[PDB]
Design a protein around this ligand. Structure first.
Ligand SMILES: Nc1ncnc2c1ncn2[C@@H]1O[C@H](COP(=O)(O)OP(=O)(O)O)[C@@H](O)[C@H]1O
Ligand SMILES: Nc1ncnc2c1ncn2[C@@H]1O[C@H](COP(=O)(O)OP(=O)(O)O)[C@@H](O)[C@H]1O
Ligand SMILES: Nc1ncnc2c1ncn2[C@@H]1O[C@H](COP(=O)(O)OP(=O)(O)O)[C@@H](O)[C@H]1O
Ligand SMILES: [Mg+2]
Ligand SMILES: [Mg+2]
Ligand SMILES: [Mg+2]
Lengths: 370, 69, 370, 370
């Protein structure tokens, strides 16, 4: 049999089978509800569209996100997403195969229990397991000693591991991610005249973000160059056949990652969190973590993030130490690529939580290995 | 082949020197004695002969190693 | 056949064969146990690392010393060390060859019996012998009349011998050794700001001690010189690419040997113990012992210890009488170099304790020659 | 004249006059800097608020602590704190009166010198003295033989004294204190959903700690009772009119004191350090130290700490020996109450360090009695 490896994310859902190199299906995790009357007769009355069809018909829908900052807020919508993924998208009955899910570190306990109950009582899978998102990245990378820097939508976290002994006191968590960058892009695009308010307009701004953005190696010099000349300008086309012309905002959106004071937050940029995590471990292992940094998640695909990260860490860290930022391509799916590998391993095939085990022990079972 | 055999000669020379050092230490200890046990009287002669044999073997090995060079 | 000559020490293990000039293998006598969870799958779990691999991975282990002050405290870990030495390190089955061990003088009786039992019932060596550490030094030195001053880690002892007639009432024992110096180094390095607490940090401090230390010929004048100028400063580099700068502490660590009141102890310095041991023997032999002094053990490798020892003894002892401190190089292995010689001797090959002798006579056998 | 007795602490400042029973003023040792723009006109431009007004307006400030782990990190802020204490809070010119300060044991030398210089060159007090925090506790307690266990914010130390002969080799120091407990409270409160990140939010968590916490007599049984039933739950109200409901975390925060492995630290709990300190003294005085233990500092106000301390020490120590934990009320100010008494004593009025003495001898003066 093949064991599904679903990765319920904060901004996308990637579902596939074990022993593959890419998710079988990938689609946004949104639920759209109709807003208007409906005048024609004979058309099917849909209470709510889910998945990609909602993204197709965003004009007359009120799109909502069941997940936010990793935590799950709405449960009916999440169950609808899971049903759509299992039946309509993957087209495989869930009873036959086990399943593997991923949850970010330091999340509330209740989340795990509710997930388990919804995956046992309602869907009736024969076995389920849940894993920390950061850890699975190291299987995909191919090493055992490192400091992953998973940065998904919603939240970003750092988890240092050494010789396969995760240090739990050095783990760091932070609520700066792609959604805040999208909101800031809207707020700063307001200056030139372009006003985006509704949710679908936010979806458009998200596409604008994805296509036209980059991270400057140095910020003040880039601002001076953009102000003096007019070479840092790009033209994009809306669905309405209108042309936006973006200038400085190309590198003021991602810059909030390194300067969280733009949004009014107070925490330090991501480089400082990485450095603090490294310096919260023991003295003897700091060199190895320095040597092997790792990035994951979609948000770390901005052109030029690796160079700035290396420069900042090198400036912060002492000399005589060599810093490398392992930033392989296709990092977007890295987390998922871990899970499939973890499923394949023969040893891991003994660590599931069978249904009868949950029936007997109770909800606490999952937390024993937490 | 030349490099490998030269390395083997070097290893043999190192082992010979290591043996010489220990034999010299034992003879140095035994010399100080004044009324040695009858067994020690023979052991001293045996070690004295073994030292000479090792020294000639070392000389031959170093000569061969130099010849290869 | 060749007879193993192992020297279970207090801070290092040296094991080798007879008729050699150096131990075949040398490695610290520590046992490390993992401290953290362990998150990766497949690595294969290990309960406890032993020997040099534990020193390699000190970051995530809790290093423990099975031996302390010569006495053996933990046995299940002392047996693990012995097994590692015989099989993994030396790579020779213990059944074929006999074995020779070394034990410091004035140690508890039970130690000897337990060592014997563990070396007969479990490992099944055909014959075992045990010798006093100080005596074996005199074979390596090459003389018969002297007063050895073996100072290993853990403890330091003096054993005067004359014409091969060890005087047992003049033997002296004292519990000042390298471990206390390491602790004092930590305590006094605290002043400049550098704080070392964990065991691995103690291991780092031990290296700091080994590299940068020396014994001043005179103490008050050296302190005055170090305070007035800034020439007695050295720079050392941690594993974390940080730079320590040591000043006076270079010669305040070993000075506790001659002034044990630094640690709160009350006994007299080592020179006074040597003088007392010499003056506790008969009148007619004091000149010969004064003439031929011997140093051994690692702790006596501080640059300048021989000169200060000679000066102090000359000041203490009467004039008209000549003092020399025989302090040959490679004194570190001196004790072991004795044992191999003792194994070689033809006469000594009659003095072992065969297995059947221990089976018949019983545990008391070993103590008959004590 | 009256001599001021300030106690610059790690988390609070207590300043008062001699011959009193309580500090004249007590206020937190923080410095807040504004974070936002400032739009109104006619107001007073303040670079930085200090003391209690900063605590009042924590909403829009970035609070920083000049002291940490006893050591002083930032000096400008510390000077600002001292100026605020002398002029605005106490309302007495510092030239007329001498001053007495307190510094924890085993701290770096440079600290003392810099403190002296800042208290002579800038403020111009006619005489200054500095004392060890633990020692002053014994004057307030009223005995001469004991083992103090001062545990302030920042650090915790043990100093055994006997007949007024402080043993310096038995002193112990450890970096576990209230700040680590506050951080642990944040980390474990994360589980139920409540996420506190900013500094003012940490200040709120500190109040939560102070109000609702206690130490269980035994830990496993308490966890079982809290899990089975729902009687160990308390409700607290934030400044935002929201209600937190705390359960187990009531007694998992202080438990870190007795099990430092929660934070990843490796040292032993406080009972083991107390036992080791007692067992490092001479044989003849251990009974007296066993009889008279003393606690000080704010951190030792958790309801039920005395009982657990007594139980643990009694279990560890041999029978036939009687253990009592002298834990008087109002222990919070105990250290300060010592200093005032020490100021009053007629003999002590000869031990100050006059200004001319420092001018002539130099900075080393203070260290002569160290
Ligand atoms: N090529 C890209 N360049 C810049 N940002 C991207 C890119 N691809 C995705 N993103 C950002 O990452 C987010 C998706 O992250 P995702 O990989 O789904 O994280 P997770 O898997 O944890 O949900 C999107 O909201 C988008 O803003
Ligand atoms: N070169 C050196 N300089 C100073 N101290 C040393 C040196 N080498 C070893 N030591 C000290 O000696 C100790 C090791 O002693 P060792 O020779 O093992 O005695 P034993 O064999 O009785 O354990 C170490 O703890 C170390 O502190
Ligand atoms: N009543 C209390 N209950 C529990 N903890 C307290 C209480 N009062 C103070 N604390 C803790 O003690 C700390 C203050 O310690 P403090 O007495 O100021 O030490 P110091 O005098 O060395 O600064 C605070 O951070 C707080 O967390
Ligand atoms: Mg992701
Ligand atoms: Mg030794
Ligand atoms: Mg205090």
């Amino acid at each position: 049999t093949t064991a599904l490896v679903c990765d319920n994310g904060s901004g996308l859902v990637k579902a596939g089978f074990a022993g593959d190199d890419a998710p079988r299906a990938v689609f946004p995790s949104i639920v759209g509800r109709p807003r208007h009357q409906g005048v024609m007769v004979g058309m099917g009355q849909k209470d709510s569209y889910v998945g990609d069809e909602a993204q197709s018909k965003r004009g007359i829908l009120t799109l909502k996100y069941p997940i936010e900052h990793g935590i799950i807020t709405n449960w009916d919508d999440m169950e609808k997403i899971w049903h759509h993924t299992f039946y309509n998208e993957l087209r495989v009955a869930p009873e036959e195969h086990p399943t593997l899910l991923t949850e970010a570190p330091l999340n509330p306990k209740a989340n795990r229990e509710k997930m388990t109950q919804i995956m046992f009582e309602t869907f009736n899978v024969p076995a389920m397991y849940v894993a920390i998102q950061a850890v699975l990245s190291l299987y995909a990378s191919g090493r055992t000693t490192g400091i992953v820097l998973d940065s998904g939508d919603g939240v970003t976290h750092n988890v240092p591991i050494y010789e396969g002994y995760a240090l739990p006191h050095a783990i760091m968590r932070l609520d700066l991610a792609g959604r805040d960058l999208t909101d800031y892009l809207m707020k700063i695009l307001t200056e030139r005249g372009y006003s985006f308010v509704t949710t679908a307009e936010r979806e458009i701004v998200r596409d604008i973000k994805e296509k036209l953005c980059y991270v400057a190696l140095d910020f003040e010099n880039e601002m001076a160059t953009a102000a003096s000349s007019s070479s840092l300008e790009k033209s994009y086309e809306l669905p309405d056949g209108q042309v936006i012309t973006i200038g400085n905002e190309r590198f003021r959106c991602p810059e909030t990652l390194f300067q969280p004071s733009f949004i009014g937050m107070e925490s330090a940029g991501i480089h400082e969190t990485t450095y603090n995590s490294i310096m919260k471990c023991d003295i003897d292992i700091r060199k190895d973590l320095y040597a092997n940094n790792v990035m994951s998640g979609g948000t770390t695909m901005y052109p030029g993030i690796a160079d700035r990260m290396q420069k900042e860490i090198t400036a912060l860290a002492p000399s005589t130490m060599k810093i490398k930022i392992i930033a392989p391509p296709e990092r977007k799916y890295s987390v998922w690529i871990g899970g499939s590998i973890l499923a394949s391993l023969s040893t891991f095939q003994q660590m599931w939580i069978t249904k009868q085990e949950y029936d007997e022990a109770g909800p606490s079972i999952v937390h024993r290995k937490c | 082949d030349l490099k490998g055999q030269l390395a083997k000669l070097e290893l043999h020379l190192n082992k010979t020197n290591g043996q010489i050092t220990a034999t010299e230490r034992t003879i140095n200890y035994l010399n100080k004695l004044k009324n040695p046990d009858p067994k020690t009287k023979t052991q001293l002669i045996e070690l004295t002969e073994k030292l000479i044999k090792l020294k000639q073997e070392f000389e031959t090995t170093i000569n061969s190693q130099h010849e290869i060079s």
